């Protein structure tokens, strides 16, 4: 399991599936997070909360809570002209 709590502040993922009781998606997704959109991680607190991060151009913080139950994944690809 790869959540959105496994990346490091400085990385790029993007989120694919979104775990959850449903309700939890929901909420999620009301915010701006979605499958699809990429999520820049800004800052992620030494206690594991608040993670913040910048999508869909805001900038807020994420509850580990669902940032543990999110899936996305660490997209590396290299840069070229």
């Given at each position: 399991m790869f959540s959105l709590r496994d990346a490091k502040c400085g990385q790029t993922v993007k989120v694919v599936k979104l775990h959850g009781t449903g309700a939890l998606k929901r909420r999620?997704?009301?915010?701006?997070?979605?499958?699809?959109?990429?999520?820049?991680?800004?800052?992620?607190?030494?206690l594991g909360d608040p993670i913040?991060?910048?999508?869909?151009?805001?900038?807020?913080?994420?509850?580990?809570?669902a940032a543990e139950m999110?899936?996305?994944?660490?997209?590396?690809?290299?840069?070229?002209?």
């Open positions: 999620i997704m009301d915010m701006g997070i979605t499958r699809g959109c990429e999520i820049y991680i800004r800052k992620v607190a030494p913040q991060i910048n999508v869909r151009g805001y900038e807020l913080s994420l509850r580990k809570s999110i899936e996305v994944e660490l997209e590396h690809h290299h840069h070229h002209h």
